Design a protein around this nucleic acid. Sequence first.
RNA 1: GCGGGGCCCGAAGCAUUUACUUUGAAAAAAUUAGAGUGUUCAAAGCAGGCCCGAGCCGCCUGGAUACCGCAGCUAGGAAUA
RNA 2: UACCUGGUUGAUCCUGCCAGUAGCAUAUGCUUGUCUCAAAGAUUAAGCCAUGCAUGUCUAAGUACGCACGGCCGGUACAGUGAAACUGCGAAUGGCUCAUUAAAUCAGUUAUGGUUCCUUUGGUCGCUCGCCACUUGGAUAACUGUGGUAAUUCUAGAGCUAAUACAUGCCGACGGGCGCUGACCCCCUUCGCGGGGGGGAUGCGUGCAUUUAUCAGUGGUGACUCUAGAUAACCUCGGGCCGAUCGCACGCCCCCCGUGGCGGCGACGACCCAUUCGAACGUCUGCCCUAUCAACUUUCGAUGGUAGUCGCCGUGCCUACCAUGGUGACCACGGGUGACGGGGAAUCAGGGUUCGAUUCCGGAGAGGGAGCCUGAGAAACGGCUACCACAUCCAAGGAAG
Lengths: 118, 153, 204, 259
Amino acid sequence: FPMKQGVLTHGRVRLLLSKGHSCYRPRRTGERKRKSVRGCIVDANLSVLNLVIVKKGEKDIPGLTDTTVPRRLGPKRASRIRKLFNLSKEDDVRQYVVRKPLNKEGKKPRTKAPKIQR
Amino acid sequence: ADIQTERAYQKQPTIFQNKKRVLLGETGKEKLPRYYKNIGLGFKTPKEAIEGTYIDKKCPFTGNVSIRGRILSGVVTKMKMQRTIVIRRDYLHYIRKYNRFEKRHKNMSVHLSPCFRDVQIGDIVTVGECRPLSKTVRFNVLKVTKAAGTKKQ
Amino acid sequence: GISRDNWHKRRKTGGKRKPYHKKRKYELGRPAANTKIGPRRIHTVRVRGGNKKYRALRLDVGNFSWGSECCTRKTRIIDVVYNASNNELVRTKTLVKNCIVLIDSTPYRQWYESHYALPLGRKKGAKLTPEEEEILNKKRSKKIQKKYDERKKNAKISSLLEEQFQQGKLLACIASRPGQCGRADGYVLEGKELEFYLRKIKAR
Amino acid sequence: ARGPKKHLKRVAAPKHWMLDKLTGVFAPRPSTGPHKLRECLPLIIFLRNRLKYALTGDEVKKICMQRFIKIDGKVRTDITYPAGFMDVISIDKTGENFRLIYDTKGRFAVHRITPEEAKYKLCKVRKIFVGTKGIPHLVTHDARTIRYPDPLIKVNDTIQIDLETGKITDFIKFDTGNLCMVTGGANLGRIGVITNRERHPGSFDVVHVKDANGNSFATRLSNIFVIGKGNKPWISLPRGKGIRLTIAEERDKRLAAKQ
RNA sequence: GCGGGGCCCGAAGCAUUUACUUUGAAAAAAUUAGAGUGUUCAAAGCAGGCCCGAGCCGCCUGGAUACCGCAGCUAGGAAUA
RNA sequence: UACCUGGUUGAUCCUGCCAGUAGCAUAUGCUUGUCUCAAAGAUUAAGCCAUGCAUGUCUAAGUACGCACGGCCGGUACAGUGAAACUGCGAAUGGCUCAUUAAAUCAGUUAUGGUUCCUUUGGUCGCUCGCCACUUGGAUAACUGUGGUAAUUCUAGAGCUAAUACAUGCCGACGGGCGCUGACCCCCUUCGCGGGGGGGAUGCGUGCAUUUAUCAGUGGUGACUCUAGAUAACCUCGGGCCGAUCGCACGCCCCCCGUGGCGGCGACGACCCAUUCGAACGUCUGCCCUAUCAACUUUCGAUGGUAGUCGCCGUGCCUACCAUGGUGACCACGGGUGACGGGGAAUCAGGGUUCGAUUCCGGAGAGGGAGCCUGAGAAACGGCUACCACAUCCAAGGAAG
């Protein structure tokens, strides 16, 4: 039962998770279902706890602070292409979109392009 | 013999009472209009409902009650219960099982408009119907025709 | 969940009744709003039909009406001095639809001297020089002094009303429905009616 | 229960729609529209029971999804739209142009018209009101509204509007001696001139109706639909001619025509 | 209702109100009574009917009609009560 | 077919009742070939249920970056079809049964002028005078990828990814008109005189809707505190409106110039007015058995008056203050009902008598009471949580009803 932002109870309590809190995907509109949850205080009653590193320390962890997987699901809105590239104005933004080479073994290579919005 | 008997200033809403008293409007001459309307199927507005001095939110001539629908008739039997008289309308139900009639009645409470002086025991009263006024009071007194009188010693 | 329909009353004869169905949604719950005086807090509740009513949890100001001279501007709300219905509400400063509320007069003061050219809210003299005398002087021309000095015959008010203009505040009456619509509007006491409600304030 | 209905059982549907007792359990259940669910006749059974251009309910959709049904000039693609009174259909594929008025026996009559008189309709007014900014409005027998009307048109006048344009076309003021058709009650489908509009304060007004053949009957006012000055209809006029025949008057013209 | 002409005929007064009767509206279908129809007859059903000369854009027609008490709405009748 | 016969007696004539008869509607015996329409777990038990299911849904036309399909027909916006997911609409209709329920539901009849109403339509959609506008912003899901769990339509962290989701938000129309104000009009009665105006520089405000109060009497109804217009302001930040949308067949003048100006049919969004669906609620009349149920209600709202409180709207609908009233042998109140109400069914000289749980409409309830979210529509149970009672999985931790 996952840990939840702002419970502050080292233990396991039951709250009524509405559409949008955390830890419960509701199944119809307005459906409030009360499910048990675990408080945000850490304990040794945890089989696993997630962790997010926010600063480099010493060295190259093998496969963790190197091997950047290149971001393939890139910009599609015309202010995410118009946030990265520093294209000024009247630049024909459509030509300069992020693209992808395609490499199924069974088929020939392709390059694929998104749609666009705004 | 005063009108302001309740704790709040009872007034008709529509007529505007606070209008421009300057020294051109001298305080030795005091007057206000008195609001009244006319309903509809031919009833009079009696004398003391136009120039009268009373006040009501539920009189059919000078209150917000717009009376419409049925019009029924009855006999006054009980004249207690302020601004509300109890009329005992009385009919003759027919049963076809014996081909003979049956006396039945169910009395009914109506709103006494306060423009009337003598509404005594035993009076034929015509009464129309309107919106719900209270839990028992729906209907409303229009006009009292003569009964139990024209000559009392 | 508070009901509002008929079946928990006793009927006309005075005999009990047994309800045949659960109470429906259209007898919507009825919490008391308690409009009181502070800053502005306004809450909403969606109702049947999708409409929104602004129930008024706390207020500052209103949009009162002088009426007789057709002067409607804002003013702020000071104090509650009388309420005819329930004697609880006036010692705890709650605004309802017919509570005699006390408000300042200085937004009506700066309209009165702006239009009628009389001293109002000023009583002794020798202090009214900087911008307080020029609200009527202005170096008016011939055609201006003609139209304002004929308005002197339509510029008297009964002495029990502007006596508190000199002293500062007016008691008005709410006519809007706070806790239902979301304002504290209303007319200003005047006439024989001002003679009434000051007398009942006097006798409490 | 908790909300409004969206089915309709068979026998609740009116008896002049003439539905089979045994084909199934349900009715058309027409859509919400300008003509209410009891008076009106929907487009569906008009094609599969009346005109018989179809077989099932599936057949009626796959002519009506291909957009050749023009109720009052407007291309409609739903299957159970409420058609109503003073209606003109338009196939515009092989020239149909029907008009659905009540027959002499109280039913909707398939009635053919030329493609040049199919260019309008007539609308009994039922409420005018001065709208905002100083303009007047009105409303029709169905759910149509008209801005800026001719102010001789008073209450329960019948106006005319022409399709594909929509403006006012003709008006005819309600008065005695003038021809009308009753569109509801025990006398609907019989057509006659007006003796007088007899009035009631408060209650329903009931009028005295004289036919063209001297019969004197009467209905209340909320079914009278005027289509005639003096006696001339402004519309094509069916067989039966708005004259209802008695049970002896029918049987001799029915048993001399199968000879 | 073709400032005072005549062939004018109303808005209305309903001048004790009702009880009773009479006519007219409004009274969901089904069902019961019933009108048409060789489902092969019938309970049923709402359908069916008529000629190829390939013109056969296929013609004509049915799917009626009452019964819906009591209580209200209507215009009458005024003996009896 | 307005119909009777056998029995009290040694007999006769009676009052009486028993039995016979004929239905039609349950069960059951015995028996049974064909053929056409065929009721059916309601009667007691509104008792409990293992299981498998009875509600979802893409249009050319809200979002494709799944390589999952396309010949990537080529040096790049997308040949589209598409699995999933986001959004929009439903899931409040059907369907099951009759436990409640005796002026209740319900049947007419008449209102809502005392009110809300998704969709469909028909109207409104430059009416407002105010330095991103050739389009402004932040995530989130499907997904690459690490998982915990004994377990469920359990789901956490990290990567990024759109909008008709969520916000914001102006250009142009828009030049101004309009009443309010006010240093300049002198041409007029300036002649000690006082005038009567038009012109204004100035500074405010200009709509639909909300709200308060006011003037006045186009269109109004047997009838208005109706609608419409004018005067004076507000305009709720969990804040009302004046389209930052998606396609389809392409065209007009191209003249500041090979760049910007302009057009069609749509498809959705859209406050409000009216309709349509309806719902709510009020009026009048109408119900079974019972007096071994004759007085009932009123601290505790019982009936009415004020004045508010929330409420979609009427009101004891609450509260406070008052009033002392209301209903009754014309059967109230109390109780019983093996009572859901009706359209009907059987029966039939006429009067009636009995049933109608049941396929049509109206109401009630989804184990028993109660409370709510989202929605136009719910006191929803093929939605949620609490309690009661019954009941499942389990590795004993918790899930599921």
